[PDB]
Amino acid sequence: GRDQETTGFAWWAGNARLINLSGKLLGAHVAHAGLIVFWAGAMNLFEVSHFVPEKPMYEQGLILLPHIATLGYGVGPGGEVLDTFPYFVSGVLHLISSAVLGFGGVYHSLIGPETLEESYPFFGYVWKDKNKMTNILGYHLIILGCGAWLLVLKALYFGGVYDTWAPGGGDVRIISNPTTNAAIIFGYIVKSPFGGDGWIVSVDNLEDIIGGHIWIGTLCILGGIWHIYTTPWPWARRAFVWSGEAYLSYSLAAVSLMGFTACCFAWFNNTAYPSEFYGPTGPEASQAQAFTFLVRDQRLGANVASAQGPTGLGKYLMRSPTGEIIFGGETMRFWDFRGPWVEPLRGPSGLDLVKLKNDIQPWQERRAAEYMTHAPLGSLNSVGGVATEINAVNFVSPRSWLATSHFCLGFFFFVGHLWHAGRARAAAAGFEKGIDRVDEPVLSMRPLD
Amino acid sequence: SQIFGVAFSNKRWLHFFMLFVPVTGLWMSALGVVGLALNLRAYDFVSQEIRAAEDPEFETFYTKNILLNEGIRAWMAAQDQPHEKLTLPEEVLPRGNAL
Amino acid sequence: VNILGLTATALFIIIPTSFLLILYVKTAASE
């Protein structure tokens, strides 16, 4: 290793010593990738060892098994678990691959060549070599496009994926005719993120998901070829800062946006995050409570279409500000919620009165009662319910865990983007270490600020 | 000066100001707690209470907080002041609706 | 009240403002 005497970096910034050491930086990267794959495999094996078949997995504090189940492995109708051997195989494959990646990372960190430029010019790079930077970016874009196409191939030919919108309570489905229409695909990304629109989080069917993945895979492959065979244009050269810290800051901003978006997916989306595996969303549980009390009081008669609340607005049913028949109470704020257990009960004007009177299915009743009893509310020591609840239920929603963790990660990575973007600008300009004390800029400016 | 409009120009004055703000704030809060020792509270705005008593439409966040304080006292008193021996039936506890 | 609070507020504004303005104008004429 190095020291502050030869690098100018203290130990708490010691990874900065790897900025201009290509081989050791590659070793740190590969060891880190091994760490990520290690956590994936170890957490998967932990979750399958602690998995209990009769209970829903969202009651068991699991976040990786819902992902693999959403891929359509070991699950059947209604998301009932049929086998855990696929999850075990996924965990084992990740653990062994992490051993290989850890060996590679340790090798390149310890006894590999310190810089790759002199002996391995294909892998050698300087940060200001914009052509080689776009070459590496192109290779990674091709790899990411191949991963998106792997998801597409899984959904199209290799068993499909779990459709929560399948009739009867959801099932693993082969997607036929994915939505490849450019208007439909790119209307998601220019949609507003506000209520009733939700930007890309509101993608509500597997056809749109798989078609968008076809689009993103093909675009990633094409952009990868483009960046292999092109050099950044003069406007890009003028606009950007070309250094390793600057590239890191760009990636930090991008992954901060992705982390915030993933938080929103975990909190709102029930298609890519089926409620059978992740538990209900907040809107889902509130609408489920309203639906459960409606069906209970209409079993008791009570004429739920005409019952009136204390405010006078409607105890069970009311109108949205655009006129749709919606559930009453504070769950009016969640009137835009769409779920497989409630969509068959809606017609063009919203909740249909005669359909809600006569067509309530037992599976819908059971699912709504379960989602009411398992709302995403709990304490961080995992006491289910609101903050006033007593210690009886050991439950926190995986949606809540994912949203909280990934909002925190997105925010810290935005802060890291700010730190590294500012430092990259200051280091490119030459004053990242301080003011020169002999050519101080402000001392040459006109006064009165 | 170019970001916020004003800036310190005197280092002395700045360090003092950094001394002065928390000490002054804590002394003001201590005076307020001394007022609370005698139950000399800034609890209510009497004009707004009059308007709320004479007008059932008038609601402010201050009136909401008065209701919340009433709930706090009523639901806290029996367990918090055992010497008062308050066996309050639930029918006198102020509640909202359903919840 | 409506008018005793009014005169209290007006006096609390004006008398310390008068004191501050006296000292400031004296200083600014001095320098």
Partner: peptide, 30 residues
């Protein structure tokens, strides 16, 4: 009446802010 007093006090505070920004005693570097 009281609304006038509140608005006047807020506007006077904003005027003091305006004067403290744009008519400050300039920091002299000598």
């Amino acid at each position: 009446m009281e609304a006038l007093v509140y608005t006047f006090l807020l506007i006077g505070t904003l005027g003091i802010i305006f004067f403290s920004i744009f008519f400050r005693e300039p920091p002299r570097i000598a």
